[PDB]
Each structure stands twice: as structure tokens, then as C-alpha cells.
Nucleic acid binder design. Structure first.
Lengths: 82, 123, 130, 205, 85
RNA sequence: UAGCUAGUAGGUGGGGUAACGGCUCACCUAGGCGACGAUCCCUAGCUGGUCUGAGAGGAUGACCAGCCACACUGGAACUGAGACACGGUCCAGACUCCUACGGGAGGCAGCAGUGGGGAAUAUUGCACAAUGGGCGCAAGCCUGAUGCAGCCAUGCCGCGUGUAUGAAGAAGGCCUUCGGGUUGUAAAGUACUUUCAGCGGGGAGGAAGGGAGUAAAGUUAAUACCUUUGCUCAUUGACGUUACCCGCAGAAGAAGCACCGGCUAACUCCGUGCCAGCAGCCGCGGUAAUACGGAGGGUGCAAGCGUUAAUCGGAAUUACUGGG
């Protein structure tokens, strides 16, 4: 089963997640098909806080990927009319 | 030159042996340390150098040079062995670590005290 | 009472650890002199056959048969307040002895040395540890 | 980290004035300069190539207050930049925060400037920095916060700033102690005496 | 080892007879057709093939056979019974 | 290590595998590999990568990540889509334990922790607060993965151990041609400051969600149920006596280690006397030791400093770049 999920990179007390498409049986930092965008939870207001390419995400939705709760919250953050 | 000879038989790098056969690259070894006696050196020295034949814990029979001024060794008192040739005693390729196990440090030393294991002058 | 002189001197670490395990107890308090040999077993009783039988365990393999060596009176434990016990360590630096729990009593060979120690005036926030 | 010792013996050792003991007072002549680095100052050394390279390195290090590993890191940051290595190394040494505070006149000596940076007084772009290893970016503004402004230690030491060259690449306001950083310094502007070529030849091996 | 989920062991014991017993009767029907191959009677071979076909397809339906083993049986056994006839 | 192979090499036919397949059996031929290293012995998890090196190369691949193999040893099958299976089954062997002695229990190369080995390596800690995995519609449950906490200067980085002023150029130590110099603005004294520790108070962020209630749009016969979105309330932190900020007091609690003949940064005096001893190489010590030991001073690094062990460079002393 494919899924779109965060990967938990960064340092101790310095999180930096990687939204990525991967199988559920693989590891969190393990093998992935391809990466699309990123998220930084400590990215308070500066030049860039979140990049997220919606084309490949819509392509993986067209394939059957299960979106997790944080990635769905990022989809509701990157709104089509906002 | 003559590259076809290198095609048949490649240029084999010499594997030089180590100066201290210390069983797969370890810093120190711990031995039984018997046979405490003095050894007169080679020709331009004319001295009496203290030495000990150290039966190591891996089966090897090495002989390490006893450094420092005075020691408490008598056929016993397990010590620590470090590498390095002595260039004064042929057959001796090792040194004794002072401040280590049972051989105590050198009495009344102030300068060069990390080597030979002497503490800081307390007074 | 007497000493530790470590017959079969291989692997001292079972007594450098396992008797320090017994040094926190009320019966046994191990005393370490500076010269790194001749470690004193503390006994408040007389029969030290308890520790000698206890030296035949899974992590206890050294014998240390006893003899007669005279060290007299109890090593009165004292750790004085700062800036003042430093020169007390400095003047007789060959006359200290580590204890079980990193203490330094004075050294006890006779009553006259304890009288000289009381003459030396070690003002102390006193704790007995006994 | 810091030397915190005989900062006057070092200028006698190098011979040139390292500006460690600058102070409110002028050129002292109170330590018998150029003729007594120590006990055996009457000896004339052989002074070889590695000797003059090491003396030049120690001279630049005790001018700028940088330790050996940190200066090797500055050389690694100098060899990677554009232009040439020797100009880049002195630009990186000038880009230290304490050197900028020293050129502004906010403190008599360099150690006093380092202490002024360290004890929560020097603030650049509204962000306080205590460690002197901050790489000063171009087009910044350095000042002193209001809770640490003019407790006389900046004041009389500013008068020494009236006796210095007052270089071109930085401007001080001198009414509210608000400096202004500008473009990077040219090689033909900073002190005109120190030799980067011996440092390059030393760290090339 | 002591485990709360040891039920999957003995239930597989509950499997290892029954499903295999079905497999057992399956292959015996197949072997019956081989008896017709040793008999030479094409009518008995056709009757045995018609007897073994729906039960081996039912065994292919219940997850025991991946409907390519039993397909191979139907293929080569049909080839034998129309080569003999 | 110069011959190896007999299910061996290939073909036909039967069976078997989720599937080609000597994968497995019946028949036929004598083929197949090999000096461009077949078979045999030793060693070794492989790789992205790490270190060094201008590059080419050399060792390594420990931590992060992918694959493979293993679960006290060997073998075997079942369930299951996926195991011929770490915390599943059986059999045979070794080792601990119980027995009422008829018979059974066990496999830390999991997290912790222990014996032994070794020079060498940690706590029998907190919680699902967040991520992920399993089940459930959901709420909720488990998670020694994880998020952390404790120890170890093991490695890197930063800060401090005061700053300015201060000559009688004090006392003491060392040297001396006993004139004086050195330690030395160093210390004492005076004026400020308290970074970091101690104490007392505020205090984020890692927090998204989930629960209850209300409104609107879908759905439907249905303003009932259910999905979704605004909106109201009570809220969810092991870290945590948190990061960070303010206040109290007092320079107050905080500096060692190597070297000093050359290589390579730095000099004298005293004590032995080819004895004690140092040493990485040239080497010193035989009664005037800049090389041993002690005193003073200087140099270098710095909460680290020396020694030992390993890799690379220098070493073009493995020369493919680049030797004879």
C-alpha cells in the first residue's frame, strides 16, 4: 500500500519533515519512490515556509495513495482558492 | 614500462610487516611480566638497562624495556605494554606504561609527568 | 585489621569493584592508600572470615590470606570546609588515604598522630559516615 | 579560548606593535620594545624561511586574536572564495564582529571590544550577538542597546577613535553610537604592513 | 514460547487435515484418470474427466489451487484423452 | 591450487512451482568449464558513502540509508497473498531449572541489566505529548521504533575562570661580573562588571488533532441518521525544577597538559657521573649535561594536553599519470 507521509529528518529539537510517497511497510527514513515538496514546522514567517507540488500529489491520488492526517492538513493549508 | 607484463602479472604492492606484532592493531596489551633483570646494551653505550620478559595475555612472549627511575617488580605485578622500539636493546620492541597497573609511578618527578604517569605536584 | 595483598595477582578488578560494592556497608569500609597496594579491609568486628568466604563467588576469585600487620585506630573520617583543607592536603601529601565513597580521614597509625591532627585545627562541617 | 595573559610581551616578541596594549594612552615606550622579547633578547636568530612564516602567522594571529584551528578554518574559508586567497583571508579576518567594533572605536583595545561584545551590549540588525566569530554581512548596522549605552566605557575609548585613521569601509554616527557597515575592504587599505604571502606559503603544505 | 496469539498455531492444525484432505481427494480423482490412461478405455477416460473437472475447479476456487496448476492438469489431461481417442 | 564435472553439458517426454527453468524423474548423445585463472585454500557481508590525497589512487564502509543472510546448532513442513519464519510448530544434539520424578519449561546476534573476555564502551528510567506501524467506522488499546531523560571531555563548537588602572619597579624564588637583571602590571591596593554556576519569580514552541454543542450544503420520502466546512465551550506535554527573560548577593565557585640540542616554538643554575637515566631519527650522560633528575624562566595548545594503535599524504620508496 502506497501512502504520502512525513519522514522526520533534522536534528534533535530541530525537526524538519519530508513529505514523500512511499510504501507503508518501508521505514520512515527508508526507501521511497520519489520526493515531492517539504514541510518545516519551525518555519515561522520568513522568505519560505512550505513548498508543495500539487501536480504529482494529484497524480498519486489518481493512483490510489492514502493521504495521512498531517499531509491532508498540508493540503488544507495549500488551498485551491486561498 | 612493458605494459603487457603488467597485463599478465599486475604490479603487486609490498605488504610491509608492522614493527610491533600487537595482534590486529591494538593500542596496548596486558601481560604477566616475568624475568626482571638488567641488560647491557650494544657497543657505544656501556650501561645497565632494566628489562622484563612479558608473557602477554594472547600467548606472545615479548620483552619490554622498563623505563623510569626505580620500580617494584619481582616476577609478578601485571603491567601495561605499549609499542615502540627502543634502539638500544636489540630484541626489545616495546615500552612499559607507568601510572598504569601494578608498577607504580616514578618517585619525585615534576617535569614530563603525563609520560611516566606521575601526578601533578600536590604541594 | 590487616590488608589486601592479592595472591594470584591477575585480574585485580574483581576486588577493585566488588569490594567497593561491600565498602558502602556498615560492616566493611575499604581504605585505599596512595601507594596503590596494601588496601585495608575495614572491620568493626573481629571475624573477617565473612569477606574471605565472600571472595569465592561468581565475581570474586582472589584469595588474600591473612597475616599480622599493625594499623591501629579506626581512621576518624573528616572532610573540612573549603579553602582550609587544601594546605592540609599540601603539607603531608604522602599521608593521605582514599576511603570507600571518596573520603580522606587522616591516616591512623597511632594516637599521637591524631593528637597532632587535633593540634592542626581542622574546622569542619562534620559528618561521621559511620 | 582567550589568551588573557601578557598582552604586552607579545608585541616585544613580534617586534612590531600588535595594538594589544593600545589604551587611552599613546605609544608607551615602557617595555623596551624591539630589543627585549624575553631573557635572551640580545640574541640575533638565524631567521629562516619557516621561521619568518611562523612569525608572520603568529603576528597576524595575535593581531586578530584568532587561535590556530579557527585560523585554519578561516584559511579553508579563504581558499574557497573568488579572486585570490590572500585578499579573501584578510577580508574574512576583517569580517569578524569584534574587529568591526574595534574599528568603530567602541572600546580601546581588542580584548575590551571582545568583552563589550560578549556582555550583551553590541547589537547588529536588532539581534544581539555575544560571540565575536559572527561573520559580518555587507550592508548591516551595528549599535549598542539602550540598557548598556554609554556607561563611560564606550565614551573615553571613543576619543581614541579620534586619533585613528578612521577607515573608509565603515561609518560611525558618534552621536548615538550607531555604526554602519559597507562594502568589503580593499587589500591596499588595511594596515599596509602585514604579509599574507607567508601565511599562504605556510598553509600550502 | 508463551504467546497470546498461539491460536493461529492450532487453527492451522485445524487446517492441515481438512484442506489437505480435500487436496488428497482431488489428486486421487486425478490419479483415477491416470488409471484410464493405463486402461485404454476412452469412454471411461471421458467419464473420469467429467467427474474430476468440477471438483478440481472448486478446489481452484477455494484458494488452495491458484487456477494455473489445475489449468495445467485440465490442459495436459485433455491432450492425453483426445490423443488416446 | 592445473585440471574440474556424472544430474555433469544439452535435447525429447512426464511431474512440479504464483512463473521460464535438470526444479525434479524415464530415454538419447558426450558434452560443459579453463591460462581473458576452471576446481581447491584463506579472508570478507555488499553498496551509496567515510578519511586522506591537487588529481589519479590507497585503506575503510562504525553511526544514516537500500539489499542480502541469521535468530543456541542442524533439518523439515503447515497456516498465511507474502515465512520454508527473532519473541510460530515438530524432530535430533548441547546447556540451565522444576518434578509428586510419570514428564516438562527455556533460548536477550531486542530494549535494559549480569558473568567471562578485553586496554576499551552506558540506565534493570519516563510516555504514546508528536511521527510511524498493527486493529477498530470512530472513540479508544499496544509500540524498549520513536520523542526524550541519566552517565562517559569519546569527537566538534562556543563561553568563562575577570576588566581598566596600579612602582616601592614591595616580599619570596632563580641567575650574577653580586653593579644588577628576571619572575613582573605579574601580585598587593583602588574603581567597575557578573557572561557561566547558586537561589527566587514569569515563561513560549515542539499541538496537528480528537470530544460535546450549533448553523449551512449534500444524501434521502424525511427538517431523522451519516459525510464535509465554518463556528461556540472544555481541553490533550514525558521532556519540564524546559529554551528564553527579570531580580538578589558577592571576583565571589571554576586552568590545566606537553616541550625547551637539531628536525620543530623556547635558556640558565644545582645534584649525580658511560651509574642512575632519556629517546620518533641524528643520539647524550666517562666530575663544567642548553639532551637524566630538581629549581627558575620561556614557548605551544587549551577543558583539554601528551603517549600508544590504525589509514592516507609526504612516498615518483610499487612509477597507469609517475622508476630503472
Amino acid at each position: 500500500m502506497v501512502t504520502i507521509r512525513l519522514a522526520r529528518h533534522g536534528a534533535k529539537k530541530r525537526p524538519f519533515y519530508q513529505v514523500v510517497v512511499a510504501d507503508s511497510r518501508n521505514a520512515r527514513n527508508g526507501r521511497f519512490i520519489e520526493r515531492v515538496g517539504f514541510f518545516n514546522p519551525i518555519a515561522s514567517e520568513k522568505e519560505e515556509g512550505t513548498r508543495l507540488d500539487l501536480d504529482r500529489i494529484a497524480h498519486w491520488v489518481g493512483q490510489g495513495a492514502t493521504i495521512s492526517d498531517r499531509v491532508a492538513a498540508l493540503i488544507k493549508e495549500v488551498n485551491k482558492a486561498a | 614500462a612493458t605494459v603487457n607484463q603488467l597485463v599478465r602479472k599486475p604490479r603487486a604492492r609490498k605488504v610491509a610487516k608492522s614493527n610491533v606484532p600487537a595482534l590486529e592493531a591494538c593500542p596496548q596489551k596486558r601481560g604477566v611480566c616475568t624475568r626482571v633483570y638488567t641488560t647491557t646494551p650494544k657497543k657505544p653505550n656501556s650501561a645497565l638497562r632494566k628489562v622484563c620478559r612479558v608473557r602477554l595475555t594472547n600467548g606472545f612472549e615479548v620483552t619490554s624495556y622498563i623505563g623510569g627511575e626505580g620500580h617494584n617488580l619481582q616476577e609478578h605485578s601485571v603491567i601495561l605494554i605499549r609499542g615502540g622500539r627502543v634502539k638500544d636493546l636489540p630484541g626489545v620492541r616495546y615500552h612499559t606504561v607507568r601510572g598504569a597497573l601494578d608498577c607504580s609511578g616514578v618517585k619525585d618527578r615534576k617535569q614530563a609527568r603525563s609520560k611516566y604517569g606521575v601526578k601533578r605536584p600536590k604541594a | 585489621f590487616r590488608r589486601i595483598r592479592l595472591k594470584d595477582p591477575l585480574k585485580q578488578k574483581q576486588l577493585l569493584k566488588g569490594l567497593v560494592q561491600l565498602s558502602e556497608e556498615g560492616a566493611v569500609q575499604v581504605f585505599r592508600p596512595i601507594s596503590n597496594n596494601d588496601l585495608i579491609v575495614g572491620a568493626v568486628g573481629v571475624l573477617q572470615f565473612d569477606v574471605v568466604v565472600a571472595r569465592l563467588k561468581s565475581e570474586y576469585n582472589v584469595e588474600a590470606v591473612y597475616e599480622s600487620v599493625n594499623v591501629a585506630t579506626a581512621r576518624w573520617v573528616e572532610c573540612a570546609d573549603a579553602k582550609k583543607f587544601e594546605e592540609f592536603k599540601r603539607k603531608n601529601e604522602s599521608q593521605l588515604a582514599l576511603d570507600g565513597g571518596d573520603n580522606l580521614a587522616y591516616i591512623a597509625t597511632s594516637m599521637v598522630n591524631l593528637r597532632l591532627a587535633q593540634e592542626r585545627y581542622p574546622d569542619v562541617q562534620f559528618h561521621q559516615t559511620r | 579560548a582567550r589568551y588573557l595573559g601578557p598582552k604586552l610581551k607579545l608585541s616585544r616578541r613580534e617586534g612590531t606593535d600588535l595594538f594589544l596594549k593600545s589604551g587611552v594612552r599613546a605609544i608607551d615606550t615602557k617595555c623596551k620594545i624591539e630589543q627585549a622579547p624575553g631573557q635572551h633578547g640580545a640574541r640575533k636568530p638565524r631567521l629562516s624561511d619557516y621561521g619568518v612564516q611562523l612569525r608572520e602567522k603568529q603576528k597576524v594571529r595575535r593581531i586578530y586574536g584568532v587561535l590556530e584551528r579557527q585560523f585554519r578554518n578561516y584559511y579553508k574559508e579563504a581558499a574557497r572564495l573568488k579572486g585570490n586567497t590572500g585578499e579573501n583571508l584578510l577580508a574574512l579576518l576583517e569580517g569578524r564582529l569584534d574587529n568591526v567594533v574595534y574599528r568603530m572605536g567602541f572600546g580601546a583595545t581588542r580584548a575590551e571590544a571582545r568583552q563589550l561584545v560578549s556582555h550583551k551590549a553590541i547589537m547588529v540588525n536588532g539581534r544581539v550577538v555575544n560571540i565575536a566569530s559572527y561573520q559580518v554581512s555587507p550592508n548591516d548596522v551595528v549599535s549598542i542597546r539602550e540598557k548598556a549605552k554609554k556607561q563611560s566605557r564606550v565614551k573615553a575609548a571613543l576619543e581614541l577613535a579620534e586619533q585613528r585613521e578612521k577607515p573608509t569601509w565603515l561609518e560611525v554616527d558618534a552621536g548615538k553610537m550607531e555604526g554602519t557597515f559597507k562594502r568589503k575592504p580593499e587589500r591596499s587599505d588595511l594596515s599596509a604592513d602585514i604579509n599574507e604571502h607567508l601565511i599562504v606559503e605556510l598553509y600550502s603544505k | 514460547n508463551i504467546k497470546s496469539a498461539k491460536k493461529r498455531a492450532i487453527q492451522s492444525e485445524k487446517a492441515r487435515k481438512h484442506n489437505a484432505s480435500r487436496r488428497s481427494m482431488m489428486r486421487t480423482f486425478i490419479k483415477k484418470v491416470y488409471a484410464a490412461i493405463e486402461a485404454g478405455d476412452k469412454a471411461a477416460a471421458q467419464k473420469a474427466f467429467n467427474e474430476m473437472q468440477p471438483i478440481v475447479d472448486r478446489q481452484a476456487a477455494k484458494g488452495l489451487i491458484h487456477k494455473n496448476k489445475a489449468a495445467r492438469h485440465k490442459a495436459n489431461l485433455t491432450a492425453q484423452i483426445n490423443k488416446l481417442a
